[PDB]
């Protein structure tokens, strides 16, 4: 599959309705809502080697397995907090107790002296619009300071045509007078490349 | 010493929301909406538009304590009508009047 995240900074809380009405001629079906969190941490160590990132990204996907990917220095880390996603080989041998938890709780409780929670973005009340071979999800970003921006998630199972779809999405973004935006669609696992699109799209 | 930070007067705290819709049992079809990090500036402006409507029977607001940025808005409309719709019409009317005030203000400013 292919994914592409486009972040619109100069956006309004009503821009999601404008872009939603722009695609009314291609909406086939609407699925269940989705939620995602984006936490940005900072290293607290006073001794780091040359050329190294001082921030640690964390992207928590809701209902996508209740997962959390940690990104630092172009590296990923797929973690989970649900007990149903634990392989039976880790429970049968006794290596897993059976009741996991979020990694952000450990990073904010046990490892808080090394990594401190700097930025927090909570994204709820999403919309899953299914088009003609492209699943576009819309969500608004809200931080402690209020409204942040617009987040666009593009996921398509077709590995062939994909540039025309994102080009059309950017066209509809240009029709709603939504100028100045960052388009991310790079790679490094689909969830790792997607989370990397979130990092390259939100930084 | 012990006084709270100044930026807390307008920034929303963690684990909180902007509006707290709480049904009221003092009168039929009555609701109390709690407003956070606001004062009389929004409460009186909303209450006025709530009083300009004919579907609203009762409408008031109050600031419980000046040391906390919050105020309660008690609304009570007629049977068969929701106060949330009246609040939406109030917000739309305020946005329209402010937009006409900005357009007319700029138009009159371009003549000086």
């Amino acid at each position: 599959g292919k994914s592409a995240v486009i972040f619109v900074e100069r956006a309004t809380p009503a821009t999601l309705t404008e872009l939603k009405d722009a695609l009314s001629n291609s909406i086939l079906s609407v699925r269940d809502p989705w939620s995602i969190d984006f936490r940005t941490y900072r290293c607290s160590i006073k001794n780091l080697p040359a050329d190294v990132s001082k921030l640690m990204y964390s992207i928590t996907f809701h209902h996508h397995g209740r997962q959390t990917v940690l990104i630092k220095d172009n590296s990923a880390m797929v973690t989970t907090a649900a007990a149903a996603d634990i392989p039976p080989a880790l429970v049968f041998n006794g290596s897993s107790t059976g009741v996991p938890e979020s990694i952000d709780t450990i990073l904010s409780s046990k490892l808080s002296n090394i990594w401190m929670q700097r930025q927090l973005i909570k994204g709820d009340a999403g919309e899953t619009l299914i088009l003609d071979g492209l699943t576009v999800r819309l969500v608004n970003l809200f931080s402690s300071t209020g409204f942040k921006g617009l987040l666009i998630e593009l996921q398509a199972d077709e590995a062939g045509e994909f540039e025309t779809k994102i080009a059309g999405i950017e066209g509809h973004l240009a029709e709603i007078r939504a100028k100045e935006y960052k388009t991310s669609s790079d790679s490094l696992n689909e969830i790792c490349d997607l989370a990397y699109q979130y990092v390259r799209a939100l930084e | 010493m012990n006084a709270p930070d100044r930026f807390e007067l307008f920034l929303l705290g963690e684990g909180e929301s902007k509006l707290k819709i709480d049904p009221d049992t003092k009168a039929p079809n009555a609701v109390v909406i709690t407003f956070e990090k606001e004062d009389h500036t929004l409460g009186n402006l909303i209450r006025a538009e709530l009083l300009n409507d004919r579907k609203v029977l009762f409408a008031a607001y109050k600031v419980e304590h000046p040391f906390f940025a919050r105020f309660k808005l008690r609304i009570q409309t007629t049977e068969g009508y929701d106060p949330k719709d009246a609040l939406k019409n109030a917000c739309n009317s305020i946005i329209n009047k402010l937009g006409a005030l900005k357009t007319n203000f700029e138009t009159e400013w371009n003549l000086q």
Binding site: - | M1, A3, P66
Partner: protein
Amino acid sequence: YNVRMDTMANILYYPQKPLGTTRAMEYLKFRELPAGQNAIVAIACYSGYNQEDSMIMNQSSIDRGLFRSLFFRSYMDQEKKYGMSITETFEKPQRTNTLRMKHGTYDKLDDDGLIAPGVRVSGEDVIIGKTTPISPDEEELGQRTAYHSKRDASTPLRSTENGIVDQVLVTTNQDGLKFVKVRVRTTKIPQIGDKFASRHGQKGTIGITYRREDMPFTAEGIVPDLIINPHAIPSRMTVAHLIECLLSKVAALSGNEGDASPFTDITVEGISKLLREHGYQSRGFEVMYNGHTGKKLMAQIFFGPTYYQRLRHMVDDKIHARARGPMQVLTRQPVEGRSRDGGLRFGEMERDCMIAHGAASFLKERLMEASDAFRVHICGICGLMTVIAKLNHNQFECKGCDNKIDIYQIHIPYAAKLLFQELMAMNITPRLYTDRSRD
């Protein structure tokens, strides 16, 4: 004051001369060295936060530097030599060989044991590090036989204080002893608990602080910096407080400082005419508008500038709470004083009030667990505290009456035990019996 080391100083930021000035001030150097500021004052019953000599001050005026003052605290330390053999030395104490070291931080000290000026310091911070030599065979208490070296005896900053060290100087005194004086400055922003006075006997603290949009305003646009309660005036019968406000308004409009001498020919009607010539109301009233609703007030407000002064009394030097602290050495009771972390006194009248309410359990708890509670053993034959108690093996005796079986246990306050022991030292027997022999 920049070249002196005075203890407990308070220098106002923007000292302002009054408007209604007296001629005698010219001979008292008051216009050159004023002790207050002129503040726009309204006399009204606003949000009820003005009652009982309470005042509401504008927050935006406070943020712009109104009645803000500086406090300079000087800590003077000196090293001494008893019999030349023991010599106190100013130095940075090491946490390895120094005993009796305070829990404060020693990172702000230099190599000589002092804090250079400009370093921001807070409470429980050592300003001057001083150590005293000790003898190994003199005390040997705890770990004194391991530290070997010296004992800490530094002079830290106050527990509740904080600020920026202004100036530090070192000098030899009369007999050649190297002493050092320190001076730390701290800006004390006017708080709600701070007290303010005027030039008419009117004194009172701040009730609450509001912002410009929360303060009433006139039709012209002048916001009061301080509002007081009308009920101050009639009872106290200070009419001069209104005449100084009116004449201060006329002086603020005309630009000439009004003469406020005692025995002159200046009347109130003339000041009313001079104010009437400037366009305002001759009686000092002015139409005010509400700050919350923006609606005109039904009654006009007496509105005008008035000279005010800030007193030494502040809340930051008064508030204190104690929950299990240090006790005295004599009575083993909570100490006296805020600097020593002392508790409040539950005097005799308070106990009499507790008896008036009929609460004996709160009295017993307040006079035992809340203060001091001691456990002693008395003998059955004689009611004196001669019962030697060696309870590591559960053993008891009472000397002089042949008892090793019947020993009673009682809980009495330590002060009562001091009374009984002083009576025994005064040849008086306070025999205590748990049973009623008289019946």
